[PDB]
Swiss-Prot record, chains A, B:
It comes from Escherichia coli (strain K12). Residues 18-44 bind DNA. The chain holds residues 4 to 74 of 88 of the full protein. Degraded by Lon protease; degradation is inhibited in a HipA-HipB complex and when bound to the operator consensus sequence dsDNA. Residues 14-68 form the HTH cro/C1-type domain. GO terms for biological process: DNA-templated transcription; negative regulation of DNA-templated transcription; regulation of DNA-templated transcription; regulation of growth. Keywords: DNA-binding, Repressor, Toxin-antitoxin system, Transcription, Transcription regulation. This is Antitoxin HipB. The gene is hipB. Degraded by Lon protease in vivo; half-life is 17 minutes in wild-type cells and over 200 minutes in a lon deletion strain. In vitro degradation by Lon is Mg(2+)-ATP-dependent. GO terms for cellular component: protein-DNA complex; toxin-antitoxin complex. Antitoxin component of a type II toxin-antitoxin (TA) system. Neutralizes the toxic effect of cognate toxin HipA. Also neutralizes the toxic effect of non-cognate toxin YjjJ. Binds to operator sites with the consensus sequence 5-'TATCCN(8)GGATA-3' to repress the hipBA operon promoter; binding of HipB(2) to DNA induces a 70 degree bend. This forces HipA dimerization, which blocks HipA's active site and thus its toxic action. May play a role in biofilm formation.
Length: 71, 71
DNA sequence: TTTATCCCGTAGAGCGGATAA
DNA sequence: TTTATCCGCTCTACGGGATA
């Protein structure tokens, strides 16, 4: 786990976590009450994704986040 | 710097950093080129804030973020 | 099976700008 | 001076649903 500097970096990292556990978009989406389409839009086009969707997906991946120094 | 689980919690943490360093909304907005109004809306109503905005504000506070296990 | 896209709908963001306290 | 809240605008999210 490393520092994250952009939505793109962030989505890519979460996509990796998702793949590495063999979860489909649909599994996650059902698990948290959002659309499969919505996990797709977040993964390909995260800039305009809302903070609520982020935290939901984050939770579905059994992940959290903290803030840190940018350095 | 503890684990964050919601937009409200995230905004609260970031607002605290703002105040602790004695920074105003206006000057953070000027720094990264967004509306003062946008920082206000983020601090009080983060749910539908976008990821770009979140990252722009993080940067303006010299913060970054990191992923971690939810526990 | 999996993911990406598009329709409609309603909702809200974030902009320039101007207040409103 | 600092922060919250409008208007009017354009842009997109995200929902249900259906494809591609």
């Amino acid at each position: 786990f490393q520092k994250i500097y952009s939505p793109t970096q962030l989505a890519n990292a979460m996509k990796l976590v998702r793949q590495q556990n063999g979860w489909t978009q649909s599994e996650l989406a059902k698990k948290i009450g959002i659309k499969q389409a919505t996990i797709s839009n977040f993964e390909n086009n995260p800039d305009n994704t809302t903070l609520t969707t982020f935290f939901k997906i984050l939770q579905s991946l059994e992940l959290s986040m903290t803030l840190c120094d940018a350095k």
